[PDB]
């Protein structure tokens, strides 16, 4: 039943609602300056993807611990699947953020 | 010579000028309200004694008190000239308005918002701009100190007082309680002003209805009568249909104060004023500077003899505004979200 | 409100076309029918009213198609002037005895605005530059919008409102213009950054 | 590639800056006092002279 | 679409009430619910609505979903291929620039380091005409992928639209010369009746529409509406959305014809959310002159 609301339902709905706003207008002109909302999203996704990848490596100098490469790769793939879906909501090229971050 | 009085031109130019003056005065009030933005001569602990002297003796211009002021005379003239000559421009604006209002009285002008919309609207805008400008001025507490300091520095530089000071000093004092002064000043304006304001009964009341009544009329619905979607949306009072309710409310509230006589003689005028008094608790003087209606109106009316019936009206209207206005406006916003959503969507389709 | 404003800006030519036809093909007929039925009015007034009719008839949809910039400031000020001439006491043409003339003319003036004043009309009826002077409330409303999923849909309204800020300025106070300008840019940037950060946070989750 | 190519179209996605400042920044204008002038509308419509 | 769905749409459009007005707020939400129950009784009681109509739509939805999701997987596959191709294809990521260095200075210097890995130039230097030609062809196949500048879902949708040429999807021309309002002669109106049915709460031990068909059902129904350009009129004229709107206003809660109103409007909101997401997605991927009207004309001319 759709009345039973999962955490993922809440996150998914909140994401789609907000992306409607971010994708609503290609740009706006405020005092002759041009602002492009999607470019704020692109930039943050690049930085966040980088941040999460290094995070999921779980590297600790002092204890000499690090993630099993297979487990890191599994998580990176899940991330990429979710990130790819953003193209459903916003006129952004996620391929090029993948390129930027992963290379 | 009534067709060479250039009312349309004079009203347009003065109305625009007044907005500019309100904007300039707004910025003086904010800067002088903020101790970090105030001119340094008003903060300085050394000059406060010289300032106290000027303020107490204002407007009379004339020592160990002006000792500190003596050496800083050129800097005072330099840094207070912007503020001083703004006050000068407020006075000149006032003189121009008073002259135009007198001319209109003499011309015995027919005023009807549903007929000569532009003439009526401009006439009312100017009176309200004038009124709100004088009230705003009265809130600039440091205005005497500023005008004085500039002039006192002027007379110990060039010998005598500034050209405009005598008349400026007088305006400051005469309008210290701006609405009291203006109520007596508008006695001769009262006939034409009440005529213009009374014409508002054809618009304001029907524009000031509830969300419930908006639903009954299916207000702004394009689809309530499907066969009329091609037919133009029109009335014989087009500019009246979108004229700001907020603007009208100020016209009514201040306007009827200015021709108070009509509030005792005319029930139509009284009931109009009260409808407006029931709808808000405060009005916008300019931007975020607000005027608290019922307190200020009571203060004025308690000091006049023949209007000690009006205090009851004000207080009854005050309670209604505090109790019911909030919720009435809340329901309007709910209705408008639905109506604007549906309207935007149909129009996009 | 922003959607309605956007319709007016995008489909301006639609509105101009409709109202140039209205002015030329209907308003001009009824105004002519009314003016010719006036028995007595001075030359100054008569020159003005015939110029209304002349202006309206000389319009065509072709001018819209060609993308011409219309100007009716003259016509509107003349109606204002005519109001003043016909409203003073002992006027040879008394507007109080010709109420239907004023009502017809006010309609016609609205029509001229639908041609040349659509940008100005949006400012008149919907400017919200006021938020510049209620910055605390503006930001608080934004936060409240973001934290409520069903309202965050509309969060783009806040950066869009920043475009209004310049409308609050006047040629007689240029001292404040740049300060208000810089405020509109700073707020727009902040709103768009915060919207992006929240989408980023939801994606991470 | 030819077979899958039949099912493709160009994706109209491009990159730009977050904020683009105008080519020319607005010049700050100095405040000059000038008197009320009732003639500035005489050339608009059917004007009347003093 | 042109077979069994068309057949049932044509059938149900006739069973559908000729005219159905959205009752004014004043009647109250309970009465509006009762009104819809009565007006849409024959759609509600239609025995094969789920077994045939919802079933066939779910299949359309699942098919269109498969295309979207397979394109996304392909894009993920291509981007990973290209990342591994990069070192042999001269493609370098942006490098960090310390103070006193230039971006162009180090990028050229890093290009020198990985020059022995640049495949085509090396073979052009040391390989045979046969080797060179194969490498040149191979390089072109490796760099030119769909993710680089091409997409498919738009083409999928554009082509499905051409399957809806039958006159009963859009119906007759509007009486008012603008749009239908009270008439039920467009698909979106039938979908609104179907939505009414699936929003009705069922027993606590009964399976729901979402348990039986999942999202595919709504993807199909919404796809038809979008491709017919009926999504704005659906948003305005939908029965359930109207009931939700009025209930929000009056806050009444009654059990009308065994349908607890509060529960009903809660479900409507859930499907409204889903529909808006789907419609928005379809519109996004589906990335001029408008019909103008005549102002009144005087008898004079
Ligand atoms: Cl500010």
- Resolution to 1 decimal place, in Å: 2.3
Residue of chain E whose Cα is closest to the Cα of B332: E249
The torsion angle over the Cα atoms of residues B64, B68, B72 and B73, rounded to 10 degrees, is: -20
CA E137 to chain centroid, in Å, comes to 39
Residue of chain A whose Cα is closest to the Cα of C152: A18
- CB B247, CB B283: distance < 8 Å: no
d(CA C184, ligand 1 centre) in Å: 9
Half-sphere exposure of E140 (CA within 13 A, CB side): 7
- CB E255, CB E263: distance < 8 Å: no
Window B:190-219, CB contacts with E under 8 Å: 215-216, 218
Distance, CA of A76 to CA of A67 (rounded, Å): 12
DSSP E146: G
**Distinct helix (H) and strand (E) counts, chain A:** 4, 2
Alpha-carbon dihedral sign for residues B126, B131, B134, B136? negative
C-alpha distances in Å from residue E24, one per residue of B212, E27, E243, E244:
12, 6, 10, 13
Chain D interface disruption, residue of B7, B11, B13, most D CBs within 10 A: B13
Half-sphere exposure of B246 (CA within 13 A, CB side): 12
Q: Name the token pair of E49.
A: 């609505």
Distance, CA of C69 to CA of C61 (rounded, Å): 13
Residue position matching structure tokens 């309207």:
B343
Which residue in C143, A89, B139, B52 sits closest to E279, CA to CA? A89
CA E82 to chain centroid, in Å, comes to 30
- CB B26, CB B286: distance < 8 Å: yes
Which residue in E19, E32, E72 sits closest to E268, CA to CA? E32
DSSP bridge pairs for A29 = A34
d(CA C153, ligand 1 centre) in Å: 27
**Elucidated via:** X-ray
Helix, strand, coil percentages, rounded to 5, for chain E: 65, 5, 35
Which residue in B223, B111, B196 sits closest to E20, CA to CA? B223
The torsion angle over the Cα atoms of residues C97, C98, C100 and C101, rounded to 10 degrees, is: -160
Residue position matching structure tokens 């608790």:
B281
Distance, CA of B6 to CA of E209 (rounded, Å): 74
* Min Cα–Cα distance to chain E from D35, Å: 46
- CB B208, CB B245: distance < 8 Å: yes
Chains A and E touch (3+ CB pairs under 8 A): yes
* Min Cα–Cα distance to chain B from C176, Å: 8
DSSP bridge pairs for B283 = B291
* Min Cα–Cα distance to chain B from C61, Å: 18
Half-sphere exposure of C105 (CA within 13 A, CB side): 29
Give the total residue count for chain D. Answer: 50
Distance, CA of B201 to CA of B199 (rounded, Å): 5
Distance, CA of B65 to CA of B52 (rounded, Å): 9
* Min Cα–Cα distance to chain D from E231, Å: 23
* Candidate from C154, C185, C195 with C-beta closest to A30: C185
Residue position matching structure tokens 């309007």:
B332
Residue of chain A whose Cα is closest to the Cα of C179: A31
DSSP string, B209-255: --HHHHHHTTTT-SSSSGGGTTS----S-HHHHHS-HHHHHHHHHHH
Please judge whether D11 and E156 are an interchain contact, meaning their C-beta atoms are less than 8 angstroms apart: no
DSSP bridge pairs for E150 = D10
∠B28-B30-B32 over CA atoms, to 5°?
Answer: 65
The torsion angle over the Cα atoms of residues B20, B23, B26 and B31, rounded to 10 degrees, is: -110
Half-sphere exposure of E54 (CA within 13 A, CB side): 22
E150-151 vs D9-10, strand pairing mode: antiparallel
Distance, CA of B203 to CA of B199 (rounded, Å): 8
Three-state SS at E19: strand
Distance, CA of C54 to CA of C48 (rounded, Å): 10
Which residue in B269, B267, B282 sits closest to B322, CA to CA? B282
The torsion angle over the Cα atoms of residues E55, E60, E61 and E62, rounded to 10 degrees, is: 90
* Candidate from D28, D31, D41 with C-beta closest to C77: D41
* E258 at interface of C, judged by CB pairs closer than 8 A: no
d(CA B133, ligand 1 centre) in Å: 20
The DSSP element (H or E) to which C8 belongs, if any, is helix C2-10
Residues of chain B contacting residue D37, judged by C-beta atoms under 8 Å apart: 13
Distance, CA of E72 to CA of E151 (rounded, Å): 10
Other Cβ atoms less than 10 A from the Cβ of C142: the count is: 20
* Min Cα–Cα distance to chain E from A101, Å: 9
Chain B interface disruption, residue of C4, C45, C80, C127, most B CBs within 10 A: C80
Distance, CA of C180 to CA of C132 (rounded, Å): 7
CA B11 to chain centroid, in Å, comes to 16
DSSP string, E107-127: HHHHHHHTGGG-HHHHHHHHS
Three-state SS at B282: strand
Residue of chain A whose Cα is closest to the Cα of C191: A37
Chain B interface disruption, residue of C45, C88, C94, most B CBs within 10 A: C88
């Amino acid at each position: 039943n759709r009345l039973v609301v999962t955490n993922l339902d809440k996150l998914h709905t909140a994401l789609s609602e907000l992306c409607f706003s971010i994708n609503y207008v290609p740009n706006m002109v405020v005092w002759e300056h041009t602002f492009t909302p999607r470019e704020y999203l692109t930039s943050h996704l690049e930085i966040r993807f980088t941040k999460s990848i290094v995070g999921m490596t779980m590297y600790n100098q002092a204890t000499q611990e690090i993630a099993k490469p297979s487990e890191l790769l599994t998580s990176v793939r899940a991330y990429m699947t979710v990130l790819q879906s953003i193209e459903n909501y916003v006129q952004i090229d996620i391929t090029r953020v993948f390129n930027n971050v992963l290379l | 010579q009534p067709s060479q009085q250039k009312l349309a031109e004079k009203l347009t130019i003065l109305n625009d000028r007044g907005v500019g003056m309100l904007t300039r005065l707004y910025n003086i009030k904010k800067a002088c309200g903020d101790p970090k933005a105030k001119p340094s001569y008003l903060i300085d602990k050394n000059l406060e004694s010289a300032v106290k002297f000027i303020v107490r003796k204002f407007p009379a211009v004339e020592n160990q008190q002006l000792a500190q002021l003596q050496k800083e005379k050129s800097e005072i003239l330099k840094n207070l000239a912007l503020y001083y000559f703004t006050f000068v421009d407020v006075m000149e604006f006032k003189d121009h308005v008073c002259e135009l209002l007198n001319t209109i009285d003499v011309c015995q002008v027919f005023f009807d918002i549903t007929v000569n919309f532009d003439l009526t609207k401009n006439y009312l805008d100017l009176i309200i701009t004038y009124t709100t400008l004088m009230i705003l001025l009265s809130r600039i507490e440091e205005r005497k100190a500023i005008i004085g300091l500039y002039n006192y520095a002027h007379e110990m530089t060039h010998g005598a007082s500034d050209r405009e000071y005598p008349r400026l000093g007088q305006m400051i004092v005469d309008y210290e309680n701006p609405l009291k002064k203006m109520m007596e000043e508008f006695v001769p304006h009262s006939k034409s002003l009440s005529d213009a304001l009374i014409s508002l009964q054809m618009v304001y009341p029907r524009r000031n209805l509830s969300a419930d009544q908006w639903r009954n009329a299916q207000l702004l619905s394009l689809i309530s009568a499907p066969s009329t979607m091609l037919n133009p949306a029109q009335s014989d009072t087009m500019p009246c249909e979108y004229l700001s309710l907020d603007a009208m409310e100020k016209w009514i509230i201040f306007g009827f104060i200015l021709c108070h006589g009509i509030l005792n003689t005319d029930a139509t005028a009284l009931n109009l004023w009260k409808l407006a008094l029931q709808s808000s608790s405060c009005l916008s003087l300019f931007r975020d500077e607000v005027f608290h209606i019922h307190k200020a109106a009571e203060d004025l009316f308690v000091n006049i003899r023949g209007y000690n019936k009006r205090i009851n009206d004000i207080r009854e209207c005050k309670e209604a505004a505090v109790s019911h206005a909030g919720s009435m406006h809340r329901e309007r916003r709910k209705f408008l979200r639905s109506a604007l959503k549906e309207l935007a969507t149909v129009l996009s389709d | 409100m922003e959607e309605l404003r956007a319709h007016v800006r995008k489909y301006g030519p639609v509105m101009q076309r409709y109202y140039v036809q209205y002015l030329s093909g209907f308003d001009a007929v009824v105004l002519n029918e009314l003016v010719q039925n006036l028995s007595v009015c001075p030359e100054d007034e008569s020159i003005i009213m015939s110029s209304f009719v002349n202006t309206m008839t000389s319009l065509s949809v072709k001018q819209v198609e060609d993308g011409e910039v219309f100007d009716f400031r003259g016509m509107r000020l003349d109606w204002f002037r005519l109001q003043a001439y016909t409203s003073v006491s002992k006027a040879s043409l008394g507007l109080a005895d010709h109420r239907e003339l004023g009502k017809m003319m006010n309609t016609i003036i609205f029509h001229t605005k639908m041609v040349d004043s659509l940008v100005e009309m949006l400012v008149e009826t919907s400017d919200l530059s006021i938020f510049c002077f209620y910055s605390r409330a503006f930001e608080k409303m934004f936060q409240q919008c973001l934290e409520l999923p069903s309202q965050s849909r509309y969060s783009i309204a806040f950066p869009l409102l920043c475009t209004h800020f310049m409308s609050c300025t006047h040629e007689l106070c240029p001292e404040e213009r740049h300060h208000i300008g810089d405020r509109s840019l700073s707020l727009c940037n902040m709103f768009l950054d915060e919207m992006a950060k929240q989408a980023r946070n939801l994606i991470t989750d | 590639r030819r077979e899958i190519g039949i099912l493709t179209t160009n994706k109209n996605t491009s990159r730009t800056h977050k904020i683009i400042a105008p080519a020319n920044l607005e010049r700050p204008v100095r405040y000059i006092r000038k008197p009320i002038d009732y003639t500035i509308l005489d050339d608009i419509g059917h004007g009347v002279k003093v | 679409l042109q077979g069994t769905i068309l057949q049932y749409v044509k059938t149900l459009m006739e069973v559908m009430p000729k005219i159905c007005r959205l009752p004014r707020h004043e009647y109250g939400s309970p009465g509006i619910l009762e009104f819809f129950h009565h007006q849409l009784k024959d759609i509600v009681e239609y025995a094969e609505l789920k077994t045939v109509c919802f079933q066939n739509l779910r299949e359309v939805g699942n098919a269109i979903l498969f295309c979207l999701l397979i394109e996304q997987s392909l894009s993920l596959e291509e981007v990973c291929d290209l990342l591994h191709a990069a070192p042999f294809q001269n493609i370098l990521p942006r490098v960090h620039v310390k103070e006193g260095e230039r971006l162009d200075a180090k990028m050229k210097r890093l290009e020198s380091k990985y020059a022995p890995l640049h495949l085509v130039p090396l073979i052009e230097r040391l390989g045979t005409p046969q080797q060179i030609a194969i490498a040149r062809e191979g390089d072109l196949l490796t760099k030119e992928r769909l993710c680089c500048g091409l997409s498919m879902f738009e083409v999928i949708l554009t082509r499905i639209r051409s399957f809806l040429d039958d006159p009963i999807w859009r119906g007759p021309l509007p009486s008012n010369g603008v749009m239908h309002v009270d008439e039920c002669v467009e698909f979106h109106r039938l979908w609104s009746a179907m939505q009414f049915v699936y929003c009705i709460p069922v027993g606590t031990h009964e399976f729901t529409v979402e348990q039986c068909f999942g999202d595919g059902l709504h993807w199909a129904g919404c796809m038809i509406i979008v491709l017919l350009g009926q999504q704005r009129r659906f948003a305005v004229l939908d029965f359930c959305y109207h009931l939700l709107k009025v209930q929000k206003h009056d806050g009444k809660d009654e059990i009308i014809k065994n349908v607890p109103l509060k529960k009903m409007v809660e479900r409507i909101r859930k499907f409204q959310i889903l529909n808006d997401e789907i419609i928005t997605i379809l519109d996004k991927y589906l990335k001029e002159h408008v019909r103008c009207f005549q102002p009144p004309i005087h008898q004079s001319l």
